[PDB]
Amino acid sequence: SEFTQLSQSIAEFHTYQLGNGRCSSLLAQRIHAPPETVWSVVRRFDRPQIYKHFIKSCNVSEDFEMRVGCTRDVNVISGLPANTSRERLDLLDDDRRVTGFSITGGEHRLRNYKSVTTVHRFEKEEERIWTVVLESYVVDVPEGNSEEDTRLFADTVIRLNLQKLASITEAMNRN
Amino acid sequence: SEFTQLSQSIAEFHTYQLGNGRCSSLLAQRIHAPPETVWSVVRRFDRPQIYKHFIKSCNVSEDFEMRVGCTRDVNVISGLPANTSRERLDLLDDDRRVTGFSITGGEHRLRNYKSVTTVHRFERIWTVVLESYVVDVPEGNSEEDTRLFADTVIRLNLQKLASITEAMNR
């Protein structure tokens, strides 16, 4: 009744098929803000700078329109030299609060990365409406790297981004 | 006096010797906690993992000395292959709350990196932590990018430092 809405998502969107040279992970974050607000940032494929770290800039096309197959160039500085990540919107559903993308090139740390993020309502007593965000990915493990190492990297940045997301979003709920 | 102490600290440790092939920066973090507490975290050369991000592990010698000249191996979390960063403790003055280190090798993104951190009293009781660094920029690489990488990691580390330290006040 409570974690049922969540375990359904995990099953459909955050559950993965142990490929040979591939790895994945799932991460969660509580935000003290309403899902509608959180969703309104997460869904903006156009501007991931708002809740993500290490983004120098993000460019889309002049005639930009958000739809599955959508494209963005993300100029990242989480390493050196700078790096332009070519990413594509894989899915977007404003009703179920589900969005997802992949990295088609330009990012040698995360080859064939595919991610999905889902926002959840959690009202658990003066039950103010809180949120839980889930973010998972699947990605290639570079040959000559351990699963663990590529996983530590992806998880660390996702964790920091989800923390920024919590702040930016918790700020919008006391403004 | 507290602002004189800070300004003199800048002049002595956070001021650098320009220009081409080289770049530097200074960042600051106000932390609502006593500087005594912050300094006891910052001074721990053998465990930067307490407040710094992207460290998989940090190994010291089996008979670890804690004096200028100490070394530490930092296994860094990049998306790249096993990147061990060798760091030397340049400076450690408990009375002035000043530490500093250099990257002697193994970290290709930050060659000849030298950083200094100072902790300052401001009066609850509040602290300011300043951190600056000087690093190489090989020609062809853009100064802006390398600064941006450096500045972002320091910022995140200092935010966590605030958190960890502000938590140590029960």
Largest CA-CA distance found in chain B, in angstroms, rounded: 49
* Whole-number Å distance between alpha carbons of B66 and B47: 12
Min Cα separation B149/chain A (Å): 6
Q: Provide the token pair at B134.
A: 């000087």
Which superfamily does A1-175 belong to? START domain (3.30.530.20)
Residue positions of B in the annotated binding site for abscisate? Answer: 52, 82-87, 109-115, 131
Tell me phi and psi for residue B8, to 5 degrees. Answer: -65, -40
Q: Which residues contact A32 (CB under 8 A, 6 or more apart)?
A: A128, A130, A131, A166, A170, A173
Cβ neighbours of A150 in B, within 8 Å: 79
Neighbours of A87 (CB within 10 A): 23
Which of B142, B76, B150, B152 has the alpha carbon at shortest distance from B107?
B76
Q: How far lies B73's CA from each of A152, B48, B80, in Å?
A: 18, 11, 17
Resolution in A: 2.4
- Does B53 contact chain A (CB < 8 Å)? yes
Neighbours of B94 (CB within 10 A): 10
Cβ proximity of A115 and A135 under 8 Å = yes
Strand-pairing partners, residue A133, are: A29, A119
Non-local (6+) Cβ contacts of A106 within 8 A are A73, A83, A84, A85, A86
**What residues are paired with B98 via a beta bridge?**
B93, B118
Tally Cβ neighbours within 10 Å of residue B119.
26
CA atoms within 13 A on the CB side of A131: 25
| HEC-encoded secondary structure of B103-146 | EEECCCCCCCCEEEEEEEEECCCEEEEEEEEEEECCCCCCHHHH
CB contact under 8 Å between A80 and B146, yes or no, is yes
User: By the CB < 8 Å criterion, does A77 face chain B?
Assistant: yes
Sheet holding B22-31, edge to edge: B22-31, B126-136, B114-122, B98-105, B83-93, B71-76, B55-59
- Of the candidates A147, A125, A129, the residue with the CA atom closest to the CA atom of residue A18: A147
Q: Test A77 with B53 for CB contact under 8 angstroms.
A: no
User: CA–CA separation, A2 vs A13, rounded Å?
Assistant: 18
Tokens linked to A68: 């599955």
CATH H superfamily, domain B1-170: START domain (3.30.530.20)
Considering only CB atoms, which chain B residues are within 8 Å of A110? 79
What are B119's two structure tokens?
A: 């902790």
Question: Would you say B35 and B97 are in contact if contact means Cβ atoms under 8 Å apart?
Answer: yes
- Give the strands of the sheet with A55-59, arranged side by side: A22-31, A130-140, A114-122, A98-105, A83-93, A71-76, A55-59
Within an 8 Å CB–CB cutoff, is residue B54 touching chain A?
A: yes
CB A110 to CB B54 under 8 A?
no
State phi, psi for B152 to the nearest 5 degrees. Answer: -70, -50
Bridge-based pairing of strands A130-140 and A22-31 is antiparallel
A24 touches B at CB < 8 Å: no
Cβ–Cβ contact B57 with A under 8 A: no
Which is nearest to B23 in space by CA: B105, B136, B102, B108? B136
Q: How far out from the chain centre does Cα B49 lie?
A: 12
Which residue in chain A has the smallest CA separation from B81? A145
Contact status, residue B113 vs residue B100, Cβ threshold 8 Å: no
Domain boundaries, chain B: 1-170
A109 among the known binding-site residues? yes
Range list of H helices, chain B: 2-13, 35-42, 143-167
Distance from CA of A82 to the nearest CA of B (A): 6
